[PDB]
Amino acid sequence: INLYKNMRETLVYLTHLDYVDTERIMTEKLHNQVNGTEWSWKNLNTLCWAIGSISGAMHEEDEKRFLVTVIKDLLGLCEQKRGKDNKAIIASNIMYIVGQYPRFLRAHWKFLKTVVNKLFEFMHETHDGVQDMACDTFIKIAQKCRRHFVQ
Amino acid sequence: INLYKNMRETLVYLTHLDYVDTERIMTEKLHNQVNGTEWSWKNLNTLCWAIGSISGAMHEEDEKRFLVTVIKDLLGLCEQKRGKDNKAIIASNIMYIVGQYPRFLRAHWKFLKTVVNKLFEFMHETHDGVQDMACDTFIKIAQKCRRHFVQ
Amino acid sequence: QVQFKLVLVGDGGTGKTTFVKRHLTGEFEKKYVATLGVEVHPLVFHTNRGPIKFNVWDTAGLEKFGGLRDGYYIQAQCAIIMFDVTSRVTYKNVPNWHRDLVRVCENIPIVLCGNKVDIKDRKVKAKSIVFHRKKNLQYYDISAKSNYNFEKPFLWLARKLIGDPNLEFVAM
Amino acid sequence: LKAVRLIKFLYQSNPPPNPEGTRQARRNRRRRWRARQRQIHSISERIRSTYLGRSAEPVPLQTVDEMTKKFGTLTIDCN
Amino acid sequence: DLLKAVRLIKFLYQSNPPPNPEGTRQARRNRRRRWRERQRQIHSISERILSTYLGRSAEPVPLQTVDEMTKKFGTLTIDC
RNA sequence: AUGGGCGCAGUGUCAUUGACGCUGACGGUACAGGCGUAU
């Protein structure tokens, strides 16, 4: 955890220096995943962890746009892949990423409602890890958006 | 020559599809040269040929800014090195590049005068190939900017 | 010693004779004395790995002077097809030469050479030169006059024969 | 920064059409100059209005909802 | 204090929905030149807004054509 | 918003260093501006 925190601090500083290059880099590796050149569960998980790590390092609009692009690409990938294993991996990654960026969720009620509905849909899933992922993301989202849930 | 023209056409179409990515890829490979990761006469020559290939393919403002960045980094690299061979290679490549970009030259009289004076300095050089390259770049610049020499 | 049977195909004295002479003497012939039948010439190179000998059979390219014709190809160890980029007809004739060569030599390296590219008037554009693609021939733009790519075909053939991909010719 | 200064700088940078030359030349220059003046006036009025002018809701009107509806549309259908 | 200028610039970028590229290569040449004049105007507005209070940081941008020249000179090969 | 025929800059087709345009980071840094006109 100390390793991750140090890496997050370093990468956040670098993003403050040049956020555009970093955003291009995540986008490029995301495309490498979409095209299947760099396809592997470990690589996707690492990329999504990195993307989540830098929440708050960008201005609101830039983070909004980057999230929109990333999510659209991720959903395209989920439609692209065959096999429940990879689809669940991608869904879990998406949930983790969105959890790491609660500001966007607070700014967009409809997306939040849709996300929580999809999470409840997942909760009925029997496949390994889906339910635990959904519960973890649910508690994170609750902690970070209670106001929006009860307001 | 047909190979080069085909590559040039492909890259120009790609640039017209999204030129920011091409610009930054050029900048990244230039930095790779600067930091010594990809240092080799062959690699720098290929990079500079490619940079010339898209001459005039971009809008003048963006082309101007990108060329300024490239030239400044190349001058820094020249300052970095010792050895006649490497400096001559860098100078030859820079002069080829500037020759490929007549529009910027016509937009800046002082730059033209500086290039031609440095060409005159080179012409007295004895090291192999410097004079030939200087003369070739000079004829290219003449062909492309004759109007600003006599006015 | 370490010699290979090479067969050169194309229009007679349309570059084959000129090419052989240019590699032999270094002079660039101007006259066009159409080759009669075939002329066998030793042609020696020196690589990083020693001497190499080509038994170049510069064959006649004119039917009237073909003579034995395909009989020359028997036991050939490499083949250089030629054509003049300034005349499309000598290019359309390329598939016929390739057919005859493969028919006699089923599995031999083949170099498609465009001669006298130096002459400014180029008719067979580089775009349309494609037969080697499907046939898997190794292509070269050459010119026995200015020696553009003057050595590339022979170097490629030597590499393919000896098997050394990085083998390089040496002056002596 | 003040509107007066911006407007004066805008109107200063556009040279008036040259009265010299033929009638048709001057009149074509006048037409092009008047079109570009209408463009300048539109830009100046847009600046005059405010410094943001637009909300970001057009984006969800184009992408965020066009992504969320299909996010709901996602279906396992097995595999 | 500063975020507002950034939002203003991003809007002015977004407020020019280029032109629609239709017509012959000369009418399209003219549209290219009109859009280029529009880009010129946008850059001028951005640079002037920078001069308002940010100029103290980005003033050298046009002037880099003299510093780049001092760098183009002094290419002395005093040694190897 | 419109693009005329040539200032020639890359060239696709054939009889391919000749002809029609497109196209050329072109001869062009040119030229054309409804049929008074306040759209």
Swiss-Prot record, chains A, B:
The modification Phosphotyrosine is found at Y4. It is found in: Cytoplasm; Nucleus, Nucleoplasm; Nucleus, Cajal body; Nucleus, Nucleolus. HEAT repeats lie at residues 65-103, 110-147. Changing L75A: Enhances Ran binding activity and does not abolish nuclear export complex formation. Does not abolish Ran binding activity and partially abolish nuclear export complex formation. Changing E63A: Abolishes Ran binding activity and nuclear export complex formation. Abolishes Ran binding activity and nuclear export complex formation. Changing H31Q: Strongly abolishes interaction with Rex and RANBP3, abolishes Rex-mediated mRNA export. Changing F111A: Abolishes Ran binding activity and nuclear export complex formation. Abolishes Ran binding activity and nuclear export complex formation. Does not abolish Ran binding activity and partially abolish nuclear export complex formation. Changing K118A: Does not abolish Ran binding activity and partially abolish nuclear export complex formation. Expressed in heart, brain, placenta, lung, liver, skeletal muscle, pancreas, spleen, thymus, prostate, testis, ovary, small intestine, colon and peripheral blood leukocytes. Not expressed in the kidney. Belongs to the exportin family. Cellular target of leptomycin B (LMB), a XPO1/CRM1 nuclear export inhibitor. Mediates the nuclear export of cellular proteins (cargos) bearing a leucine-rich nuclear export signal (NES) and of RNAs. In the nucleus, in association with RANBP3, binds cooperatively to the NES on its target protein and to the GTPase RAN in its active GTP-bound form (Ran-GTP). Docking of this complex to the nuclear pore complex (NPC) is mediated through binding to nucleoporins. (Microbial infection) Mediates the export of unspliced or incompletely spliced RNAs out of the nucleus from different viruses including HIV-1, HTLV-1 and influenza A. Interacts with, and mediates the nuclear export of HIV-1 Rev and HTLV-1 Rex proteins. Involved in HTLV-1 Rex multimerization. Found in a U snRNA export complex with PHAX/RNUXA, NCBP1/CBP80, NCBP2/CBP20, RAN, XPO1 and m7G-capped RNA. Component of a nuclear export receptor complex composed of KPNB1, RAN, SNUPN and XPO1. Found in a trimeric export complex with SNUPN, RAN and XPO1. Found in a nuclear export complex with RANBP3 and RAN. Found in a 60S ribosomal subunit export complex with NMD3, RAN, XPO1. Interacts with DDX3X, NMD3, NUP42, NUP88, NUP214, RANBP3 and TERT. Interacts with NEMF (via its N-terminus). Interacts with the monomeric form of BIRC5/survivin deacetylated at 'Lys-129'. (Microbial infection) Interacts with HIV-1 Rev. This is Exportin-1. The chain holds residues 451 to 601 of 1071 of the full protein.
Curated annotation (Swiss-Prot), chain C:
The modification N6-succinyllysine is found at K152. Its cofactor is Mg(2+). Changing E63A: Strongly decreases the relase of bound GDP. It catalyses: GTP + H2O = GDP + phosphate + H(+). The chain holds residues 8 to 179 of 216 of the full protein. The record marks L62 as: Essential for GTP hydrolysis. The gene is RAN. There is a cross-link at K64, K145 (Glycyl lysine isopeptide (Lys-Gly) (interchain with G-Cter in SUMO2)). Monomer. Interacts with RANGAP1, which promotes RAN-mediated GTP hydrolysis. Interacts with KPNB1. Interaction with KPNB1 inhibits RANGAP1-mediated stimulation of GTPase activity. Interacts with RCC1 which promotes the exchange of RAN-bound GDP by GTP. Interaction with KPNB1 inhibits RCC1-mediated exchange of RAN-bound GDP by GTP. Interacts (GTP-bound form) with TNPO1; the interaction is direct. Interacts (GTP-bound form) with TNPO3; the interaction is direct. Interacts with KPNB1 and with TNPO1; both inhibit RAN GTPase activity. Changing K30R: Decreased acetylation. Residues 61-77 are annotated as: Switch-II. There is a cross-link at K64 (Glycyl lysine isopeptide (Lys-Gly) (interchain with G-Cter in ubiquitin)). This is GTP-binding nuclear protein Ran. It comes from the Eukaryota. Residues 1-164 form the Small GTPase Ran-type domain. Its EC number is 3.6.5.-.
